[PDB]
Amino acid sequence: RIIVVALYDYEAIHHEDLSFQKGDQMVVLEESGEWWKARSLATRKEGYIPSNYVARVDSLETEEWFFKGISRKDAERQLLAPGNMLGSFMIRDSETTKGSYSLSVRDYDPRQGDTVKHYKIRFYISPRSTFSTLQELVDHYKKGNDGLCQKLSVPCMSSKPQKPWEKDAWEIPRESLKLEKKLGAGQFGEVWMATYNKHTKVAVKTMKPGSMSVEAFLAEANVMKTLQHDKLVKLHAVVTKEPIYIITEFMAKGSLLDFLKSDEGSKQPLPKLIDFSAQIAEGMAFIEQRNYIHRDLRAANILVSASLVCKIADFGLARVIPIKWTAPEAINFGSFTIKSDVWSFGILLMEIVTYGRIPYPGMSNPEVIRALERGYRMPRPENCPEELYNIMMRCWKNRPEERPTFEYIQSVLDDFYTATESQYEEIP
Numbered sequence: 001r002i003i004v005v006a007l008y009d010y011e012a013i014h015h016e017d018l019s020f021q022k023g024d025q026m027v028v029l030e031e032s033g034e035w036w037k038a039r040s041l042a043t044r045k046e047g048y049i050p051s052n053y054v055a056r057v058d059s060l061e062t063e064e065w066f067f068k069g070i071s072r073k074d075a076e077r078q079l080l081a082p083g084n085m086l087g088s089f090m091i092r093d094s095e096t097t098k099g100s101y102s103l104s105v106r107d108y109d110p111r112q113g114d115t116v117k118h119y120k121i122r123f124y125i126s127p128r129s130t131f132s133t134l135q136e137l138v139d140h141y142k143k144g145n146d147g148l149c150q151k152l153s154v155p156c157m158s159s160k161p162q163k164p165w166e167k168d169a170w171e172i173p174r175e176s177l178k179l180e181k182k183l184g185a186g187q188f189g190e191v192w193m194a195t196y197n198k199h200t201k202v203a204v205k206t207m208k209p210g211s212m213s214v215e216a217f218l219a220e221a222n223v224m225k226t227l228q229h230d231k232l233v234k235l236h237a238v239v240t241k242e243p244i245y246i247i248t249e250f251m252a253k254g255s256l257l258d259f260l261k262s263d264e265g266s267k268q269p270l271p272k273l274i275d276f277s278a279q280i281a282e283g284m285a286f287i288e289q290r291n292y293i294h295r296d297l298r299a300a301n302i303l304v305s306a307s308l309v310c311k312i313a314d315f316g317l318a319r320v321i322p323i324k325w326t327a328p329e330a331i332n333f334g335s336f337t338i339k340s341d342v343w344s345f346g347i348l349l350m351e352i353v354t355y356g357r358i359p360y361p362g363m364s365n366p367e368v369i370r371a372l373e374r375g376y377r378m379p380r381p382e383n384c385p386e387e388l389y390n391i392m393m394r395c396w397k398n399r400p401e402e403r404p405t406f407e408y409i410q411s412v413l414d415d416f417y418t419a420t421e422s423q424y425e426e427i428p
């Protein structure tokens with residue numbers, strides 16, 4: 001008899017899912033992935049619940065201040081998000097000391113402004129004050145800072161997680177959709193804001209029948225669906241009948257290119273723009289570690305959510321179906337590799353730092369190609385640190401093997417303002 005408890009309120013929207021309130025307990029009947037069959041102890045109804053909305057009873061996940069499976073950089077991002085203040089905090093799984101926990105606290109440094117400090121929890125942080133439960137640790141630090149940079153106030157604001165997609169609804173009838181608004185149109189099809197079965201806002205890409213094969217196209221979509229990651233747009237479903245429709249999550253702020261050029265985008269200071277680049281590097285490191293290639297990396301194929309999370313779009317599409325973002329080897333010989341993506345990434349970094357200015361402004365494709373062969377590279381723009389420019393330059397090496405890895409770029413971008421020795425605080 002396995003009893004789970006609700007972390008968030010949920011409102012049913014399908015045929016057989018269950019509504020529940022935060023605090024409601026349920027008995028688990030089947031653990032079938034994204035959706036579990038359960039019986040609500042409150043309503044006595046049997047049905048499907050999102051497995052990410054619940055936790056085992058008495059689990060640390062049930063605590064308002066506990067955040068499971070979250071990295072150091074993820075914790076900084078969640079803590080600096082709108083809704084928090086001095087002393088906002090989380091306990092989380094330690095990223096580097098497997099099996100242990102870490103404490104992250106919102107602080108303010110006179111020079112840098114809002115920062116997040118990290119403390120290893122050993123429970124105790126400092127030998128002087130020992131605690132039996134994590135709850136006890138937390139309770140102490142809320143009334144006076146016993147050597148912490150800032151005393152604990154309220155736990156980090158938790159967002160309600162995205163509903164998983166309907167169960168066993170990877171291939172859907174066209175009838176399930178209403179395409180309400182055309183957002184974009186081009187060579188290979190259109191993108192539409194849409195609703196799936198009344199309840200869910202989605203984005204739909206429509207494909208023009210092409211050189212492509214209907215069956216060959218679906219095999220790629222079918223693999224891409226399995227290559228899931230927090231920094232890759234979520235693939236939800238496909239309509240298999242021509243013309244093929246691809247259904248993804250809807251990204252409220254559209255593309256990064258349009259976002260950067262908007263009034264809101266032009267208000268993002270440099271540290272924010274570096275954080276975007278670091279999110280994109282993290283998606284490309286995942287693609288690199290899996291041994292794939294994107295092949296069409298630029299700001300037009302990055303999407304931004306309402307909370308300013310950046311995600312890579314069209315991973316998969318360019319492998320099925322812009323010379324200013326392309327490495328010279330790939331232009332010259334069609335050698336697309338992860339190294340030619342690293343080149344494109346350098347260009348995208350410059351796009352980000354110049355708020356979506358076109359690369360090589362006032363030069364044509366032919367001029368760019370001839371210039372590059374000469375050793376020309378775009379110069380450092382005005383609001384760009386020297387060290388960010390040196391990253392770009394490493395991305396733009398003529399020899400692809402001399403270009404950094406995404407794993408390495410990601411690590412440099414994530415901690416761009418933080419000395420290594422300083423990732424964790426030290427209290428004797």
Ligand SMILES: COc1cc(-c2nn(C3CCN(C4CCOCC4)CC3)c3ncnc(N)c23)ccc1NC(=O)c1cc2ccccc2n1C
Binds near residue numbers: 204252
């Ligand atoms: C529904 O599928 C997609 C949708 C989008 C998408 N584009 N836009 C907007 C962004 C800016 N434009 C501009 C045009 C010029 O004017 C200014 C606006 C308007 C649209 C969005 N806005 C919100 N949410 C979205 N999801 C999108 C991008 C890629 C895919 N598809 C894939 O990622 C994909 C296809 C695919 C095929 C095969 C295998 C895998 C595959 N994948 C992962």
Ligand SMILES: [Ca+2]
Binds near residue numbers: 300301
């Ligand atoms: Ca595109």
Ligand SMILES: [Ca+2]
Binds near residue numbers: 420425426
């Ligand atoms: Ca340290």
